[PDB]
Write an enzyme that holds these catalytic residues in place. Structure first.
Site, PDB file in Angstrom:
ATOM      1  N   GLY A  95      -1.482  -9.308  -1.471  1.00 32.63           N
ATOM      2  CA  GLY A  95      -0.372 -10.218  -1.510  1.00 32.63           C
ATOM      3  C   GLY A  95       0.140 -10.704  -2.256  1.00 32.63           C
ATOM      4  CG  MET A  96      -2.042 -12.125  -4.831  1.00 34.08           C
ATOM      5  SD  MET A  96      -3.430 -12.860  -6.117  1.00 34.08           S
ATOM      6  CE  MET A  96      -4.170 -11.150  -6.696  1.00 34.08           C
TER       7      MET A  96
ATOM      8  CG  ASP B 200      -2.988   0.003  -5.302  1.00 35.42           C
ATOM      9  OD1 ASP B 200      -1.957  -0.190  -5.227  1.00 35.42           O
ATOM     10  OD2 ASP B 200      -3.920  -1.178  -4.970  1.00 35.42           O
ATOM     11  NE  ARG B 201      -6.439  -3.993  -2.717  1.00 39.61           N
ATOM     12  CZ  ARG B 201      -6.372  -5.375  -3.112  1.00 39.61           C
ATOM     13  NH1 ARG B 201      -7.651  -5.189  -4.457  1.00 39.61           N
ATOM     14  NH2 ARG B 201      -5.293  -5.456  -3.147  1.00 39.61           N
TER      15      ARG B 201
ATOM     16  NE  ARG C  12       5.398 -14.087  -5.488  1.00 37.93           N
ATOM     17  CZ  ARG C  12       4.487 -13.644  -6.386  1.00 37.93           C
ATOM     18  NH1 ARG C  12       4.248 -13.328  -6.711  1.00 37.93           N
ATOM     19  NH2 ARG C  12       5.884 -14.598  -7.846  1.00 37.93           N
TER      20      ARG C  12
ATOM     21  CE  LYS D 279      -3.591  -7.166  -4.915  1.00 32.88           C
ATOM     22  NZ  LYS D 279      -3.224  -5.592  -4.783  1.00 32.88           N
ATOM     23  CB  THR D 280       2.264  -2.664  -4.851  1.00 32.67           C
ATOM     24  OG1 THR D 280       3.614  -3.234  -3.288  1.00 32.67           O
ATOM     25  CG2 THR D 280       1.226  -2.305  -4.772  1.00 32.67           C
TER      26      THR D 280
ATOM     27  NE  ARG E  61       7.377  -5.560   3.060  1.00 32.41           N
ATOM     28  CZ  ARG E  61       7.562  -5.289   4.675  1.00 32.41           C
ATOM     29  NH1 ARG E  61       6.738  -5.547   5.250  1.00 32.41           N
ATOM     30  NH2 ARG E  61       9.117  -5.317   4.843  1.00 32.41           N
TER      31      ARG E  61
ATOM     32  CD  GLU F  46      -2.542  -0.753  -0.774  1.00 34.92           C
ATOM     33  OE1 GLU F  46      -1.457  -0.530   0.884  1.00 34.92           O
ATOM     34  OE2 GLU F  46      -2.886  -0.963  -0.406  1.00 34.92           O
TER      35      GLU F  46
ATOM     36  N   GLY G  66      -7.358  -7.590  -7.002  1.00 34.31           N
ATOM     37  CA  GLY G  66      -7.206  -8.908  -6.644  1.00 34.31           C
ATOM     38  C   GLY G  66      -7.171  -9.355  -4.691  1.00 34.31           C
ATOM     39  N   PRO G  67      -6.721 -10.091  -4.868  1.00 38.93           N
ATOM     40  CG  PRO G  67      -7.303 -12.218  -4.221  1.00 38.93           C
ATOM     41  CD  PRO G  67      -6.801 -11.797  -5.375  1.00 38.93           C
TER      42      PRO G  67
ATOM     43  NE  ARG H 149      -0.937  -3.325   1.844  1.00 46.58           N
ATOM     44  CZ  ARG H 149      -0.364  -4.151   0.833  1.00 46.58           C
ATOM     45  NH1 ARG H 149       0.046  -5.067   0.997  1.00 46.58           N
ATOM     46  NH2 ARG H 149      -0.482  -3.362  -0.575  1.00 46.58           N
TER      47      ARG H 149
ATOM     48  CE1 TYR I 119      -6.230  -6.999   7.757  1.00 49.78           C
ATOM     49  CE2 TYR I 119      -6.151  -9.158   8.815  1.00 49.78           C
ATOM     50  CZ  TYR I 119      -5.626  -8.207   6.976  1.00 49.78           C
ATOM     51  OH  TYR I 119      -5.520  -8.620   6.204  1.00 49.78           O
TER      52      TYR I 119
ATOM     53  CD  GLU J  59      -2.070  -8.283   6.463  1.00 50.42           C
ATOM     54  OE1 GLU J  59      -2.663  -9.095   5.605  1.00 50.42           O
ATOM     55  OE2 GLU J  59      -1.052  -7.663   5.470  1.00 50.42           O
TER      56      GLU J  59
ATOM     57  CD  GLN K 153     -14.697  -3.325   5.166  1.00 52.22           C
ATOM     58  OE1 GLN K 153     -14.199  -3.759   3.982  1.00 52.22           O
ATOM     59  NE2 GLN K 153     -14.176  -3.721   6.168  1.00 52.22           N
TER      60      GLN K 153
HETATM   61  O1  LIG Z   1     -11.957  -5.190   5.681  1.00 53.38           O
HETATM   62  C1  LIG Z   1     -11.408  -4.946   4.782  1.00 53.38           C
HETATM   63  N1  LIG Z   1     -10.911  -3.857   3.649  1.00 53.38           N
HETATM   64  C2  LIG Z   1     -10.148  -3.890   3.177  1.00 53.38           C
HETATM   65  N2  LIG Z   1     -11.220  -2.729   2.271  1.00 53.38           N
HETATM   66  C3  LIG Z   1      -9.989  -1.673   1.153  1.00 53.38           C
HETATM   67  C4  LIG Z   1     -11.070  -0.869   0.377  1.00 53.38           C
HETATM   68  C5  LIG Z   1     -10.375  -0.119  -0.440  1.00 53.38           C
HETATM   69  C6  LIG Z   1      -8.985  -0.952  -1.392  1.00 53.38           C
HETATM   70  C7  LIG Z   1      -8.289  -2.323  -0.664  1.00 53.38           C
HETATM   71  C8  LIG Z   1      -9.320  -2.472   0.673  1.00 53.38           C
HETATM   72  N3  LIG Z   1      -9.816  -3.709   2.863  1.00 53.38           N
HETATM   73  C9  LIG Z   1      -8.668  -5.040   3.244  1.00 53.38           C
HETATM   74  C10 LIG Z   1      -9.712  -5.687   4.421  1.00 53.38           C
HETATM   75  N4  LIG Z   1      -8.953  -6.192   5.453  1.00 53.38           N
HETATM   76  C11 LIG Z   1      -7.896  -6.588   4.374  1.00 53.38           C
HETATM   77  N5  LIG Z   1      -7.349  -5.241   3.751  1.00 53.38           N
HETATM   78  C12 LIG Z   1      -6.370  -5.017   2.642  1.00 53.38           C
HETATM   79  C13 LIG Z   1      -5.925  -4.084   2.986  1.00 53.38           C
HETATM   80  C14 LIG Z   1      -4.885  -4.021   2.277  1.00 53.38           C
HETATM   81  C15 LIG Z   1      -4.830  -3.942   0.858  1.00 53.38           C
HETATM   82  O2  LIG Z   1      -4.152  -3.192  -0.109  1.00 53.38           O
END
Ligand SMILES: O=c1[nH]c(Nc2ccccc2)nc2c1ncn2CCCCO
Ligand SMILES: O=c1[nH]c(Nc2ccccc2)nc2c1ncn2CCCCO
Lengths: 304, 300
Positions: free
Chosen positions: B14-15, B104-105, B158, B17-18, B162, B31, B11-12, B164, B49, B167, B73
């Site tokens: 920042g909700m 985690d993902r 949320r 999850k961890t 948190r 992660e 999921g997105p 990262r 970012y 970010e 990526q």
């Molecule tokens: O451009 C982006 N790509 C990815 N890829 C990605 C790859 C593997 C697992 C999770 C995310 N993650 C991004 C990006 N921007 C913010 N995030 C969130 C980073 C923190 C994930 O908890």
């Protein structure tokens, strides 16, 4: 279920590979050409020209290694896309191993895009070894009947050829030519090494025919400082990528084709190699027609 | 052969999850923060970012941004690709479980959802996105994905709590990414009820409407021929996506509650998750070693 014969002609560019695949087909056989139209237009604009320029601007000290890497790496993604789609679409049609009812001649295999060129660019310094291993981790599972033909050609003749058989955007760089030739020779040895029962993990500290020295395989390129932990060992993530590499390559059927001859000679030499190649059954009866159409559609849309 | 249970919490970001998973015969694979920060490249999240920011600011073009963004990526998804690769051989056929793996993902976060959101943010080409899609590994049996549920403003609250390393609180990226996961959930239900994208494609010009599935994002001009037809290369990439997503088992977790509850919630969903047998007797210990070693080395 009818049988299929897949043959991927691969190796360094500039040996006359594409010409002989076409000659072979000119003789129930279909061709999957190099997706030039994707590289030039559909995926991005003049990707090959972009690759050579970037390496040149790097060698000239006009851009940084990091600027080069970011550009070289995205360009690799564009180059391999048609190869990954083709493999994913064809996969569920391939059955167990077995005159074929259909012979499919591919112009290169996904590993050229997901292993060989990225490794050569690493050697050229425009890509990091961590990025090379990310592509390797994505190499799709090796399907039964994966017959790969790699080419051989003396370096002086290859050099001479290259000054001829260029590519739109290609600049004759002999450092890159040497890198790609070395990467494919290491590939060939790696398959040998694996099929003779070699274990890269067992032989790490040490860094047809008999079993090659691990130092003569692709595993030797991944002994770089960036992948080694404080204790001198490879980080587990990088080591698992090598487990993947070994898994992908060991079930492939590799053959070497001598390109130091006339086009017709190459065609005939490839034709005889084609007899001792592994066939597979197709998963369904209508697989053959479906597969015929995929190759012809790919060819029509991307051949150039 | 003993049975395993894999659960990919997705999921997105920042909700919570961890926050919930850490409150949870069961290993948790975090992660790969150390890979993103140090092993694969230096500060990958900061780079991501910063590049978007620069593009937003007009300091760089869409093309400069795309090359950097796409290349990043690759570093982000690497640990997920190898993990799926090394695990795949151990998974057997559909089946108390001998072991429960909480990941985690799932690779689709790296090879589909984030790239799609970045395209939706103007820093990734749709062709680069379909290349990542074409590389999504085959869907193994028992692939259970838990997706999050949370109203946007509580999610913003949320997220703010948190960040990262590196970010930047981007509300446009938060909406893009939320959009992608919402579409993702609709896409699975669409495929599961018998939906055929090729058949419903014209509509863009009992199941969700194709306009509410991921297929709508690929009606992008760069992917179309002069007559409006999708080029076959891209159509084939959409056939792969349809194939990979239809056999996934999706479960929704309401995050709009307390960590005790969210955590309680996660344990309840477990009852309808599909289990599988492992391929060898020695699979459990090896899968266990893999998870603990990944965690030890890349979890920060
Ligand atoms: O451009 C982006 N790509 C990815 N890829 C990605 C790859 C593997 C697992 C999770 C995310 N993650 C991004 C990006 N921007 C913010 N995030 C969130 C980073 C923190 C994930 O908890
Ligand atoms: O950096 C490079 N990557 C790739 N990838 C590639 C991917 C799939 C098939 C063939 C090549 N090819 C390169 C590069 N430099 C020169 N070439 C050869 C270009 C001509 C291929 O016909």
């Amino acid at each position: 279920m009818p049988t299929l014969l897949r043959v991927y002609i691969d190796g360094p560019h500039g040996m006359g590979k594409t010409t002989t695949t076409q000659l072979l087909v000119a003789l129930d056989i279909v061709y999957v050409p190099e997706p030039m139209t994707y590289w030039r237009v559909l995926g991005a604009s003049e990707t090959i020209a972009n690759i050579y320029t970037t390496q040149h601007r790097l060698d000239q000290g006009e851009i940084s290694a990091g600027d080069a890497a970011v550009v070289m790496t995205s360009a690799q993604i564009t180059m391999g896309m048609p190869y990954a789609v083709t493999d994913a679409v064809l996969a569920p049609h391939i059955g167990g191993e077995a005159p074929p009812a259909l012979t499919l001649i591919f112009d290169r295999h996904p590993i050229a895009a997901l292993l060989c060129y990225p490794a050569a660019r690493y050697l050229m310094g425009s890509m990091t070894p961590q990025a090379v291993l990310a592509f390797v981790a994505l190499i799709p599972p090796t399907l039964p009947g994966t017959n790969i033909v790699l080419g051989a050609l003396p370096e002086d003749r290859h050099i001479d050829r290259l000054a001829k058989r260029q590519r739109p955007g290609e600049r004759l760089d002999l450092a890159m030519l040497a890198a790609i030739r070395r990467v494919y020779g290491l590939l060939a040895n790696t398959v040998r090494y694996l099929q003779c029962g070699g274990s890269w993990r067992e032989d790490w500290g040490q860094l047809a025919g008999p079993r090659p020295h691990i130092g003569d395989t692709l595993f030797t390129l991944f002994r770089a400082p960036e992948l080694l932990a404080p204790n001198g060992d490879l980080y587990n993530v990088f080591a698992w990528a090598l487990d993947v590499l070994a898994k992908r390559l060991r079930s492939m059927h590799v053959f070497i084709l001598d390109y130091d001859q006339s086009p017709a000679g190459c065609r005939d030499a490839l034709l005889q190699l084609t007899s001792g190649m592994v066939q597979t059954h197709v998963t369904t009866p209508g697989s053959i027609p479906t597969i015929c159409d995929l190759a012809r559609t790919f060819a029509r849309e991307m051949g150039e």
